[PDB]
Symmetry: D2
Subunit: 396 residues, 4 copies
């Protein structure tokens, strides 16, 4: 199967690669965030260090890492820069999507380009966009309409277009396909460097040989195709989990670093050593403990996703539902702890730390932004609904 994984010794080296990339991204995060430019240089930095091809099989020039390993590297990157961290994990997830959606020949085309040609994958997947028209011609499909939240599409080399019709249509197109217009309407609270602006489709052609047909081998009668395709949405929730935990780890380390370097003791405190303040220590310890719990659950849930992905068949209703519950559980804890850390870190760093030259708020802006992707109470509700009614979460 795909996503075989690298050895423990080799992954330690890939963690050092990610740490090297994280240090450089971290030193320029505030300047780049303020500039709000498309992250071309940052994508090139990820490409040059072999991180874009990490989750591609070694046959195609990738490292052959597992999804657990890939998202763990994503946490290291997301801790330095939430925006570039989101781009990396979305790229990995887009590869998981086209692996699920692609035929074997289509899978090979994508893996060769991602593994050995530096392709960055983006997708147009927002299902709430109105005014989208799609018509079928002999040449292929003609798509018209404006799509929003198109993360990484303006910097991607291969674009996955997902259309939510009565019969859904998913296709892969190159970046230079005519009719694509990228609007400069992304000026957001956080995740500013993710290129999540809107994309205009002006009579865009999706060729017939570009339509993904991997789901055809799964039964459209017993729900196998829906549950196989539903793994895409479950993995998207998992990358969000690791993204939030990565941002939380960066905010905690940044707050710790500010206190050790610039912190002044409070005059009412017993000690003149700011590092000995009892309230700073308790608060940082509570947050650190909470992150560790979220990470432990995250890595457990990601391993369970890999097992479901490697099933010889589509997961059953109970297998899919149990995995969705675990993903829901990881999503709930990761959202709460990341919001908790990025929000309350200022209570320990103090008044002078609120200067934009310090920029401790970038973690909050990033965490607070992406946590609104889908509402937290409804993911918690799904867990409790299963406890009260025995009904499994279903691909919606």
């Amino acid at each position: 199967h795909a996503y075989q994984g690298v050895s423990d010794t080799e992954f330690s080296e890939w963690e050092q690669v990610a740490a090297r990339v994280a240090g450089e991204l971290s030193a320029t995060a505030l300047t780049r965030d303020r500039a709000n430019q498309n992250p071309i240089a940052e994508i090139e930095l990820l490409r040059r260090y072999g991180l874009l091809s990490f989750a591609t099989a070694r046959e195609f020039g990738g490292a052959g890492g597992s999804l657990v390993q890939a998202l763990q590297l994503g946490r290291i990157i997301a801790a330095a820069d939430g925006s570039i961290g989101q781009l990396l994990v979305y790229h990995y997830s887009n590869g998981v999507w086209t692996y699920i959606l692609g035929s074997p020949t289509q899978r090979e085309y994508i893996s060769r380009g991602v593994g050995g040609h530096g392709w960055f994958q983006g997708s147009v997947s927002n299902p709430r966009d109105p005014g989208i028209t799609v018509t079928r011609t002999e040449e292929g499909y003609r798509v018209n309409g404006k799509r929003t939240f198109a993360t990484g599409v303006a910097v991607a080399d291969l674009i996955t277009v997902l259309l939510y019709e009565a019969e859904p249509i998913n296709a892969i197109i190159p970046s230079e396909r005519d009719g694509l217009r990228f609007n400069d309407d992304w000026d957001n609270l956080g995740q500013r460097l993710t290129a999540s602006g809107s994309v205009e489709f002006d009579n865009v052609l999706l060729r017939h040989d570009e339509v993904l047909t991997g789901l055809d081998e799964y039964s459209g009668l017993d729900g196998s195709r829906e549950r196989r395709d539903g793994l895409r949405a479950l993995f998207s929730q998992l990358i969000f989990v690791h993204l939030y935990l990565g941002i939380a780890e960066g905010a905690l380390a940044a707050g710790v670093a500010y206190i050790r370097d610039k912190g002044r003791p409070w005059p009412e405190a017993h000690s003149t050593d700011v590092t000995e303040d009892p309230y700073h220590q308790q608060l940082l310890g509570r947050l650190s403990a909470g992150i560790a719990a979220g990470v432990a659950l995250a890595d457990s849930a990601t391993k369970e996703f890999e097992q479901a992905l490697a099933f010889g068949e589509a997961p059953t209703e109970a297998q899919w539902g149990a995995l969705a519950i675990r993903v829901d559980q990881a999503k709930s804890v990761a959202t709460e702890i990341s919001l908790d850390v990025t929000h309350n870190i200022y209570q320990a760093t103090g008044a002078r730390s609120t200067a934009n030259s310090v920029g401790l708020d970038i973690y909050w802006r990033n965490a607070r932004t992406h946590t609104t992707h889908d509402p937290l109470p409804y993911r918690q509700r799904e867990i409790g609904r299963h406890l009260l009614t025995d009904q499994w979460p279903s691909p919606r």
Copy 2:
């Protein structure tokens, strides 16, 4: 005497004036916040609507409002713009400071300027500024050194300069006084339009007639002078309470306004009406309740401060301690709810609300910044310390 208050019907008219000002500030808050300019226009707006002279007696051209009424108008302004709200309450507090510190003739000089000539009062009061020197000459005192967090000084007409704590030297100087250099080093997370940058004193003269001597009539032997002077710091904490609550009220109203105008229902919700989501309603209702509790305690603590200020003598150790405990309580509650509201409002507003064209984060940036003025756990510790040891809070 001072801060007698206007009638209930007249104050309803002043609340109407504040609402008119709040609407204009709210509509331009985002654009002004980005430009980061000194708030000269906003102070003239406060001036032309009579809000700067509201807390000055009618004999000087003011409205004759009370401190309870003045801080209530402050909450209305602070809800529209946290920065301008801070300036207004800091101005009111600076009048209370010079009332406590000023002689009879000095009080009338300031009241006539603030009451009938539009003077805005700023203060240089940070006690943690090192390297400050003062030399007494035949004409007065020559002051040198850099002072930080000089809120409103760059836009003030009358500046109060406070030096030391043991043998203090407090004086009022005009904005035209030679030697004042305003550094352009205020680029902050929030409270950006408060003019809280640093100020350089280059051989600044404080004339002998400008030295405040109101504290002379209080005994320096039994602590009466310290407890009378200590009312200034308690009133600072009090305006912080009202500022935080105003900001929290603005964030709640802005989130409600967004949901009603731009909100859309979550597809998993039972209702297609976004205003009927049970989690939006529950969250907003919890936040609304917490704000109301904070306001009830805040206005009660302000009334208790007015009574202590109007005492014929300085408040005793127990009177000062009980007032400080109640102000600590209001500070703790107002800190917690304002951080709660401004952080969690995004859970109800959704992903599209994170655009900077919406700017719902300005309330968080403002509250998150100012709540770090002095650390929350130590104000809570002071309350618990009194309960466990019987030791009242005492002036510094």
Copy 3:
């Protein structure tokens, strides 16, 4: 008219009476709680000290106190014994109920009994009791069935029987009225001494002279009668607020007392004095601040209720809804802080405090029990619904 209030100096004397009663109840609270007996002696203690007649006009032998003052006395009693505090405020609320529902001659009959004859008022008002049959007789009404949560009925001298039919029937009957059986089925977590067991109705007679007719002067066409009657349910929510805050004050005081008398320092702590522990002080200060906020909002809400009760007409749609919103706000904050205090106090008191001879849990058992009377999230939801839809709460 009614609930006019006593003077400030005289209310201090009544607060001294309540403190004396609270001290005695507090010393026997644990023993009486475990015995689970009907609080006949405690009702007689309240009677001897004039607390049962405090809210009755002076012409009838009562003190002439207001509802604000009466519930403030209830908080003092509730802090010593949550069960006895609930009985006192239920007695007051039952007096408010019969004041709304009673005719002028019926009001005088009850006031003369409660004011000068020591009557304790209980009610049978649970609207969720099924299988309750009531048939009209020439003599009056015959009522059969089982009613639950009949707080204080087994110790009441005057019992209000509320029947929720197509035409609601409310009447007052003596405790010796034939057909009343008191089942020994009240063995609860907390509120154990409130006599909240079930009561059987064996063909009980409600004479026509006993049917309360005070609501007849209010129109049943424009909602006046519904909103006038709805003040009863709003006052029930108000007494719950004060009950919860009193329990929280008692729990905070009991924890402070244990720490000062029995507390030992933690070996890792900086100080060998347990009263100097920074985490004890911080937590106790946060809890103290939260209680003070809830109290300030509670007393503000009670005053607004008194104004509504004294309206020349029934409250309008807007007047009733605004009062319901404020009571909802007070109910939300009082529930949260009382559960917060009684649950978290053990973190400061330590391991030895968990002995049943200490009995710190009685506050939690009491607060945790009564806060389930009606679900908190639906009260918060009502506030958020008004913000989002503009719909005022209405009598249900």
Copy 4:
């Protein structure tokens, strides 16, 4: 030692623990209110092989690991917090005597615990004044009063920690078990006080396992420190077990006795949006605590199996991991057992329902050592680089 059984074999042990849990949960309220010594419950664990689960098969045990043993502890703790504490304290006492005992002493204990149903108790409260040990050629004479002696009144082999560490039979003269345990929760843990009236500790019974570790470089201190770290670990699993039992009890009450609120959109109580959200939040919290707890136990097993004592960094890193697990497990167990009543309702507060037994249990034990100081240790290491060390 602590090798562990296979995955398929451990599934059968989970079912054995579920059978024991179901029987305990049927009399949980009646036994808790009776406040009697849990003699029959300890025999229940003994008959089903749970007392010898963490002992090698060569001694008559199951050959399970510490990760597996504490997982079964969570199953028992979910049904009865008191009995769950006794089981994990028994397991922890085996780890203590394994660390403290000589190779010949280890086999004596393994044969009795594995092949004769011995229950191990500990007298190990470090905050007891008046404790006095006196040396004699007869051995050692111990006098004073020790409190919180969990399981001692029902233990067969008793470890006394004074350093002087020894094991004595339950029949040793001088032991006076006082009947002063009337607590909020953990009522059936036999945690009363034990009077020592000139109790003899023979030289042959003194544990000498720590002698082979150097007392000069801190190796003996760090090796012995694993005892306290494992104590904090069994507290983690106990709190999560109680939280699991409370959540399941609240869910089962709503499904079987719950009534919809008249303001709710649905007449089905299981479709209340606030019940679902609250329970789902609590469920996710427990799941995160379990994942961290089982991770920390795996790291402890490796530390114990190092042979050599863990270094300052290895011991410190393990202690940080255990503090993190302790913090999360404390917060979620208090959260679950306290907030479950918001979803169960007014009628669920009757003592015939007894849903408060979970809160009383978790609220009691979480005060064993103060939570803020365990959190402070994590933050202190982040700010000062100082690892936790054997204190």
